[PDB]
Amino acid sequence: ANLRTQKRLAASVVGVGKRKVWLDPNETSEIAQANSRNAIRKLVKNGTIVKKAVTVHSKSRT
Amino acid sequence: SHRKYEAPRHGHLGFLPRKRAASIRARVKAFPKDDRSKPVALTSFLGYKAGMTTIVRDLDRPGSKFHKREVVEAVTVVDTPPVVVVGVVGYVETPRGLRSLTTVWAEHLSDEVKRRFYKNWYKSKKKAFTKYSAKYAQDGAGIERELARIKKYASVVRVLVHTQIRKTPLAQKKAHLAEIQLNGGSISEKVDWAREHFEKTVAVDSVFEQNEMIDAIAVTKGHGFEGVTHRWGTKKLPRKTHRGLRKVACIGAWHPAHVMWSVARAGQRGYHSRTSINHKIYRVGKGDDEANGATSFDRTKKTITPMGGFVHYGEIKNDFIMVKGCIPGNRKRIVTLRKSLYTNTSRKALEEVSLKWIDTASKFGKGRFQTPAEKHAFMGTLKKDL
Amino acid sequence: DVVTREYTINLHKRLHGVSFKKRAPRAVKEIKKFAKLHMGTDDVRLAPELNQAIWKRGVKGVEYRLRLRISRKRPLFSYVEPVLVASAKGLQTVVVE
Amino acid sequence: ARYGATSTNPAKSASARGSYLRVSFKNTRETAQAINGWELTKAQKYLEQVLDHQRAIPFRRFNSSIGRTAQGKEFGVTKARWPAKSVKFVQGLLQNAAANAEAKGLDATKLYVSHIQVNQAPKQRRRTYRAHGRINKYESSPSHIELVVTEKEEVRLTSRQRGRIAAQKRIA
RNA sequence: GUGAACAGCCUCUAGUUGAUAGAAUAAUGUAGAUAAGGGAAGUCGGCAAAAUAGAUCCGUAACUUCGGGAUAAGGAUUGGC
RNA sequence: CGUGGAGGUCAGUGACGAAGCCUAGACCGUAAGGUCGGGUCGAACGGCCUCUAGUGCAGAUCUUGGUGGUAGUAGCAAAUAUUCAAAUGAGAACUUUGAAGACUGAAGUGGGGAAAGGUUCCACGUCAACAGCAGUUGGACGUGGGUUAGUCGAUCCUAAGA
RNA sequence: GAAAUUGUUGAAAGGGAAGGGCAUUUGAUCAGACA
Ligand SMILES: [Cl-]
Ligand SMILES: [Cl-]
Ligand SMILES: [Cl-]
Ligand SMILES: [Cl-]
Ligand SMILES: [Mg+2]
Ligand SMILES: [Mg+2]
Ligand SMILES: [Mg+2]
Ligand SMILES: [Mg+2]
Ligand SMILES: [Mg+2]
Ligand SMILES: [Mg+2]
Ligand SMILES: [Mg+2]
Ligand SMILES: [Mg+2]
Ligand SMILES: [Mg+2]
Ligand SMILES: [Mg+2]
Ligand SMILES: [Mg+2]
Ligand SMILES: [Mg+2]
Ligand SMILES: [Mg+2]
Ligand SMILES: [Mg+2]
Ligand SMILES: [Mg+2]
Ligand SMILES: [Mg+2]
Ligand SMILES: [Mg+2]
Ligand SMILES: [Mg+2]
Ligand SMILES: [Mg+2]
Ligand SMILES: [Mg+2]
Ligand SMILES: [Mg+2]
Ligand SMILES: [Mg+2]
Ligand SMILES: [Mg+2]
Ligand SMILES: [Mg+2]
Ligand SMILES: [Mg+2]
Ligand SMILES: [Mg+2]
Ligand SMILES: [Mg+2]
Ligand SMILES: [Mg+2]
Ligand SMILES: [Mg+2]
Ligand SMILES: [Mg+2]
Ligand SMILES: [Mg+2]
Ligand SMILES: [Mg+2]
């Protein structure tokens, strides 16, 4: 499959960069069927697509 | 026009071509002239180079500043297990040169020699010399006829010997076979000596003795393809030189319109046959003798092997020859030791050498202890031993 | 046969003098050749967990020794997994039941 | 389709060919000569070993300034290579010829490569850019391949001369 | 964040992970480097390279259009707690 | 001697094979050339007497087109760097997803525009050619979809000037 | 469907070019007269 368009839509819908988008490798069948922004919102809701946490830049030593 | 300034030529033209040797065992191209009023003896011996170390001795040379004073010298150690006589070969003089007439082999040969005749020993049926041994099954009439032919016609007698490679730390398992000319006695005496030594061993102390000048024949260390700067020693070109500076700038004049053979060129360096003469023997060592590395001054009990063993070689467990200076070839390489071709009386020969101390410190670093006992006395007890 | 064994591989001597940008990729190929020598299988598969252990300290920070578990499975192939131990020293080849 | 010159019996043979194949003509010619005259099954196993770099294809004509290997000693040469792309094209045609032989009714045990020939196809052209704003050609050399597999099969005398012959007969 | 700093060096957000590859480590190269003792003897010529380098304190000549020369030259100090 | 075309003639040759082409096959002529057999081929062509010319090539760093040796050779080395597994497929070092290791380090390899380009934007299908390796991918190929203003610009004003 | 150039098959020759002239040997091949 080619999920390039789904990752681009997921980043726009969630509001983060493409580097923070996680697509479930075990659910590529249902992800490939999601071509609209409404379908992406449903996948985010049920945990198929999640938002990864930001990389920590601690200021303890500072 | 003539060259602006005169300089001697780079390199020796008598050591051409600088190609790889045909075999790893360098050929012996000249034996000592035979004196037949002497007992039959070998003229050369086979050994393996193990490494180098250092000795201290008192100099005996009147008129020298260091007369009756200690000097520090470098020596080379050659592992020399006994060789095994397994045949003889006779030669006949001919207007076209020496020609081999007959070869007679011993009745039994070990697996060391037989491996030399095979390239795929693990798959072979090991049929070598099986039918030849049947010539001994009868009363030896076949062997007697061939030996009689050598006595009747031969003018030069040589013996086939092989090393006992299994006694060395090497992993080769395949022995080296070579011809050694017999000097002394008549042709019949040479053949009788060779026949009686079939399947026997000859020790190095029966060939060489203390304070004797010998020649070393071996193939030098290889270095692959080399540029002119290090291969021939030409001057490096200035830093400004375009197209590189490790070169010869002019390789010939306009005429003759060819590159001459005497111009330095890039090519193979090392792995050449060499014959270096006048190497005095400092010690003939015995393998079964404890305190091989001991002198009449040191008195301690220690072998010739340094602490940790010779680097890349191992331990010395057989007879060895200690020779002053350096020898062509690298460690673990088969070398041939030959008796002198002339009588030397330069007062550097015939002088008695008495070793006072032999260095057995580790050659794997800045070794500082001669023996393990000395190390224990200095450092004391460590955490590991308590 | 189907057999599982635990091995210690000395990567220090297998990466001696290797270019820094190639040391971690070279260790991957060294492990594949190591498994082929002991199991005789031309097909070697490395778990992604093992890949993280090799690349743990960058492209040029490969550990001197690694403790490996190699399994030969049904014609045959080898599967290499990491073994979680405090230190990789002092361990010899053992057979896993 | 008309093939090249052949001397085999068509009733006992099968043929295969391919045209305008985008594979090096020079590399394919060397590969074809390596199996010319071989048994079909022996040739097929040999081509598989080439892809595994166990045996090599000897290069005899188009071999200037190439490397040398120890795997050429089988054929008494020093220069040999492993042209994988040309080998796969030959393997496909060997498979097709064997399929055609089976359809006719020829047993594969006695089949051998009786004819194989590589011809030069029209070139395909691209451009390459050189220093100082120049343009040179950058072309491929395609090949035509054809092959055939076949079953193996196992007084005037003068009066003086007449008199001499007659005389000898009455002697003994 | 370091620091005088839009310098160099490391990181967060975001963005890429693209430039034909595999194996080996000869000569000669291109690029980056280090050298015992001597110290320009090299060379048309110190070309190239090396040495010097921040900050604080001390000290600073001839000459001068009195503004300079001047960071002249020449010395000392510098971490952590 | 040979070539294109013209007048006359042989009531000339020919789809039962004209012309052309191939032929270390045969014959004639000192030679320019002429004739025959075999193969290939498919629609026109020749001998002789005369007329006529854009009438004969090895060259001109000749013109146009085609093709070699060089040669599977020079080379495909700037911009720090890739690795494991799964999915897809006839086929995966290069496509997608996940994991890991890295870089740009805010005068960026980030986020918008003025010129200039003109559909390169987006989806589906899809790999012959193109992406100087590869390719299931693409700014490629095929078929369609997409740019919404009383307030943003143009439009209005004048500048050097026309 | 010519030539340059190329593949396969068949024949022949080849000790730092190849090609040519006169003469004959060997191999291959071929017309003419059997009045
Ligand atoms: Cl000389
Ligand atoms: Cl051009
Ligand atoms: Cl170099
Ligand atoms: Cl004529
Ligand atoms: Mg030699
Ligand atoms: Mg220059
Ligand atoms: Mg040492
Ligand atoms: Mg050449
Ligand atoms: Mg080359
Ligand atoms: Mg270019
Ligand atoms: Mg240009
Ligand atoms: Mg600051
Ligand atoms: Mg120096
Ligand atoms: Mg110094
Ligand atoms: Mg000077
Ligand atoms: Mg000078
Ligand atoms: Mg300078
Ligand atoms: Mg016709
Ligand atoms: Mg012809
Ligand atoms: Mg028609
Ligand atoms: Mg004209
Ligand atoms: Mg012409
Ligand atoms: Mg002319
Ligand atoms: Mg021209
Ligand atoms: Mg190259
Ligand atoms: Mg190349
Ligand atoms: Mg280049
Ligand atoms: Mg790069
Ligand atoms: Mg940087
Ligand atoms: Mg960085
Ligand atoms: Mg697009
Ligand atoms: Mg390409
Ligand atoms: Mg392609
Ligand atoms: Mg299109
Ligand atoms: Mg046609
Ligand atoms: Mg032609």
Coordinates of C-alpha atoms (C1' of nucleotides) and ligand atoms in Angstrom, one line a residue, chain E residues 9-10, chain F residues 80 103-105, ligand 29:
Chain E
rC9 C1' 29.7 24.6 18.4
rC10 C1' 25.2 21.5 20.6
Chain F
rU80 C1' 29.1 13.8 7.6
rC103 C1' 21.6 16.2 9.8
rU104 C1' 19.7 21.3 8.6
rG105 C1' 20.2 24.3 14.1
Ligands
MG29 MG 27.2 21.7 11.0

